[PDB]
Amino acid sequence: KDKLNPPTPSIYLENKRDAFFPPLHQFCTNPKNPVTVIRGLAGALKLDLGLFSTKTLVEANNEHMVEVRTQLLQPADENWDPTGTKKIWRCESNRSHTTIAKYAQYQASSFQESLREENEKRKGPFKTIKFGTNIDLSDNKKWKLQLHELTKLPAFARVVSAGNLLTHVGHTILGMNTVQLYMKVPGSRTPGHQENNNFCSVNINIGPGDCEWFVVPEDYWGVLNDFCEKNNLNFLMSSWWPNLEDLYEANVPVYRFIQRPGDLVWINAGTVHWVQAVGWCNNIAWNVGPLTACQYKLAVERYEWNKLKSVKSPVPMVHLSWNMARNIKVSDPKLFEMIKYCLLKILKQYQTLREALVAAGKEVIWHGRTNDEPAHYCSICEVEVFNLLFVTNESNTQKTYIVHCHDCARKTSKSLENFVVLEQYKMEDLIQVYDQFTLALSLS
Numbered sequence: 001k002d003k004l005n006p007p008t009p010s011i012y013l014e015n016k017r018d019a020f021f022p023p024l025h026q027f028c029t030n031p032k033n034p035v036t037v038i039r040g041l042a043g044a045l046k047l048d049l050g051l052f053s054t055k056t057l058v059e060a061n062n063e064h065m066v067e068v069r070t071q072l073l074q075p076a077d078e079n080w081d082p083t084g085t086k087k088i089w090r091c092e093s094n095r096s097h098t099t100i101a102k103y104a105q106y107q108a109s110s111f112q113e114s115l116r117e118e119n120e121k122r123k124g125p126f127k128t129i130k131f132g133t134n135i136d137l138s139d140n141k142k143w144k145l146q147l148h149e150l151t152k153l154p155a156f157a158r159v160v161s162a163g164n165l166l167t168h169v170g171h172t173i174l175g176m177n178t179v180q181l182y183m184k185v186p187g188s189r190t191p192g193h194q195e196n197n198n199f200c201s202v203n204i205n206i207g208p209g210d211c212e213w214f215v216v217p218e219d220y221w222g223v224l225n226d227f228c229e230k231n232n233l234n235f236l237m238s239s240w241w242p243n244l245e246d247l248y249e250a251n252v253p254v255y256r257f258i259q260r261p262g263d264l265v266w267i268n269a270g271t272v273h274w275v276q277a278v279g280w281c282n283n284i285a286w287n288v289g290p291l292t293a294c295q296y297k298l299a300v301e302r303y304e305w306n307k308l309k310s311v312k313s314p315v316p317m318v319h320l321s322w323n324m325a326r327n328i329k330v331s332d333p334k335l336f337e338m339i340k341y342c343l344l345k346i347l348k349q350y351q352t353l354r355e356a357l358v359a360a361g362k363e364v365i366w367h368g369r370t371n372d373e374p375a376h377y378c379s380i381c382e383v384e385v386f387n388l389l390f391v392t393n394e395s396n397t398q399k400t401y402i403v404h405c406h407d408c409a410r411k412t413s414k415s416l417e418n419f420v421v422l423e424q425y426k427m428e429d430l431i432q433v434y435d436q437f438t439l440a441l442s443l444s
């Protein structure tokens with residue numbers, strides 16, 4: 001089917017007006033567009049991509065950490081087993097560390113070397129390549145000029161903005177409300193994945209080479225999950241590179257396109273994607289959470305799905321929901337009904353637990369909270385723990401406050417005799433927030 005090769009939702013910007021045009025924003029966050037390619041963005045805005053060139057990065061922080069993925073240089077859009085016998089989903093992607101300076105040396109000498117091969121004139125076996133990924137650009141002191149340049153983007157695509165859910169989390173979520181950098185050679189692959197908790201993502205290619213993108217709409221993610229399971233792979237945790245022939249056979253539509261230097265790629269919520277470098281280039285990326293019913297729903301879904309799969313959620317959706325209710329006027333009836341629903345559920349579960357504890361003679365200790373204090377996760381199972389924290393007698397005394405969830409505390413200490421129950425919010429206070437959370441009127 002031609003419908004299994006859909007056209008790419010694309011927008012070409014000429015100038016700043018195009019970039020700040022409100023219908024651009026609405027196009028990207030529209031659930032019907034799994035991905036939007038904003039062509040000419042950097043030129044439209046006069047973004048200095050040079051601030052992110054390898055030469056500049058080395059000059060700025062040459063000993064900065066780089067996660068190295070060592071991969072096979074695979075042909076086109078395929079992934080073969082090392083023997084070259086058949087196409088498989090699993091990717092070879094071994095991990096190590098290096099520095100910007102050392103990777104830069106490899107990036108440059110890789111290019112020089114292929115120039116020489118091209119002048120040598122005239123199934124694998126496949127060559128090995130290294131991909132510099134997930135470089136952490138959160139530190140404003142080390143990256144002042146780089147991060148400042150990205151404030152020139154229209155508000156909806158910025159790392160920080162009043163309409164960004166990840167800004168309302170109220171604390172750093174590394175790589176999500178901070179910028180990540182990628183340094184590449186041809187064939188460098190970001191394997192198949194959805195974003196953390198299905199949040200939208202922004203990716204800008206720095207150049208000078210191209211990247212090639214593969215995108216599958218969110219509502220087909222279960223088909224891919226089955227493929228992973230049938231091929232002995234964890235959809236969330238394993239490295240996999242889809243066989244396009246498998247997908248076509250399974251009637252899954254695949255968006256395919258080229259991202260050129262200065263092109264911004266908008267990945268909508270839950271959109272499945274994988275990427276390979278075509279030439280030598282850098283990319284930068286981060287997440288954004290638009291205030292839409294769709295984004296909140298998909299984020300909640302992945303949050304719950306992550307519990308079943310024993311995988312940590314980088315976004316604390318309980319902490320976030322209360323912050324939204326405290327601080328955001330919500331005018332979309334659907335989104336409002338979703339948040340209200342979640343808060344009511346949280347509240348009921350918390351009240352239920354609290355009265356189990358009180359009825360069993362367990363003391364609830366008032367503990368309160370520092371402001372801008374992150375959400376807490378269970379030190380054992382890594383589930384988010386909200387409000388009632390379970391801390392051992394010893395950690396309490398030592399004031400190290402090492403957090404456990406209720407189930408993990410119980411599993412260790414049958415009657416919780418080894419724990420204290422710390423409470424970060426009065427119930428009256430949470431009831432108030434919930435009762436004052438009502439639908440704001442907007443005519444938009």
Ligand SMILES: O=C(O)/C=C/C(=O)O
Pocket residue numbers: 182189190201202203273275283284285
């Ligand atoms: O490899 C990259 O540049 C990006 C991957 C992603 O944004 O998902």
Ligand SMILES: [Mn+2]
Pocket residue numbers: 193194195201267273
């Ligand atoms: Mn991604």
Ligand SMILES: [Zn+2]
Pocket residue numbers: 378379380381382383404405406407408409
């Ligand atoms: Zn736990």
